[PDB]
Amino acid sequence: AWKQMSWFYYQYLLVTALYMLEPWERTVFNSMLVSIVGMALYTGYVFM
Template sequence: MIHTAPRQPYQLIPTSLRFPPISSLYRNRKGAEASRRTRQANNMALGDAWKQISWFYYQYLLVTALYMLEPWERTVFNSLLISVAAMAVYTGFVFMPQHIMAILHYFEVIQ
């Protein structure tokens, strides 16, 4: 059995990310070629980053089984998840220093 990489069900690269053709503002052909190559490289890097983010989001949907939910249900779930994570991070930053200091005083690491 031949193992192949899974295919993405859709491509999420919008056509608006493509750069317009080289305008007539470039007088020097070598400069225009270098500029075109630079823009193509930037476009490819941006497209690759977008593909990678789309792939991670797709994996997140599959692992959490959110792909079966309707868009509004997915939005509610993601909002709740983000708010719980934000509250946990906030609580950690506010209260953890007090708990760490209490532990250090208890074990007499600091006086």
């Protein structure tokens, strides 16, 4: 389960081309992806 859960992260690094980026550049992209998807759930629980 953990061996296949880590394989899905690998496929996410290839399609978004985050595979060929530095560790501090991956953290800048992952930060605003969870910040834009986390605030989109709070707006879906106030107008829905």
